[PDB]
Design a protein around this ligand. Structure first.
Ligand SMILES: c1cc(-c2onc3ccc(-c4nnn[nH]4)cc23)cc(C2CCN(C3CCC3)CC2)c1
Length: 237
């Protein structure tokens, strides 16, 4: 992710087939002739899409120009959560399935994985960052506290942001409960709140493994529901 002062991020297309798939996903969704009400509603929950972008002198070098979801924040607190029971897609090999499950074998059980968080602490005027290994360390025993960490400013638990996150996730869940045409693997929710009341972003990102489907995305739903349940329990801290 490259953060542009103009309020966008540039995301470089991943190597094929993933990068091209993500381009096609955005293209399909933000198709200017798209009257599909499912895809029209989905736009609300994605970064705004400004089309494919390449440097003036390098047509080879492909990026997506996306809304920076953090842009309107002063001190954004950012958490990326991979959603679903499976982070491998329907066309993965045995090896690829094994690669994906081994990365985090609790994916089926929990239905989400914290990819990272960046949390502004007021009293130190600084950020705590957690990486891949943080979320991949979390077990059933420690997931609730693992998530809670995101909402700690080093003086209070930001229950406002927790409650707001549930409310926004709920609308995304409603979207998924009303569509049977897309299944989403290894995709994420980007949570943002103000670290400097209820000012929150929750957006879907990372679409290198979104496939056509005939069924409810049950794995994504399970993850949203479980994530909500964790967030709900945190409101009782
Ligand atoms: C500032 C802005 C964004 C961001 O803001 N708007 C965004 C829109 C899309 C994406 C995006 N799409 N695909 N992957 N990221 C990312 C966006 C994302 C971040 C961080 C960038 C680093 N990622 C990594 C670290 C854990 C995974 C966590 C999220 C920081």
């Amino acid at each position: 992710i490259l953060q542009h002062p103009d309020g966008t991020v540039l995301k470089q297309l991943q190597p094929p087939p993933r990068g091209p798939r993500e381009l096609e996903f955005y293209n399909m969704v933000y198709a200017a002739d798209c009257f599909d009400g499912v895809l029209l509603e989905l736009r609300k929950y994605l970064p705004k899409y400004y089309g494919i972008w390449s440097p003036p002198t390098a047509p080879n070098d492909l990026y997506l120009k996306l809304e920076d979801v953090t842009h309107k924040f002063n001190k954004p607190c950012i958490m990326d959560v991979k959603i679903g029971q499976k982070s491998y897609d329907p066309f993965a090999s045995s090896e690829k399935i094994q690669q994906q499950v081994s990365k985090y074998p609790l994916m089926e059980e929990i239905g989400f994985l914290v990819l990272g968080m960046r949390v502004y602490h007021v009293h130190s005027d600084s950020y705590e960052t957690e990486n891949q290994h943080y979320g991949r360390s979390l077990t059933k025993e420690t997931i609730k506290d693992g998530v809670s960490r995101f909402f700690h400013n080093g003086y209070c638990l930001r229950k406002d942001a927790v409650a707001a996150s549930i409310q926004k996730i709920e609308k995304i869940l409603q979207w998924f409960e009303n569509q049977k045409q897309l299944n989403f693997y290894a995709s994420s929710l980007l949570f943002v709140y103000e670290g400097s009341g209820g000012e929150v972003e929750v957006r879907m990102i990372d679409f290198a493994h979104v496939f056509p489907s005939n069924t409810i995305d049950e794995g994504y739903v399970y993850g949203l529901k479980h994530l909500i349940s964790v967030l709900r329990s945190i409101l009782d801290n």
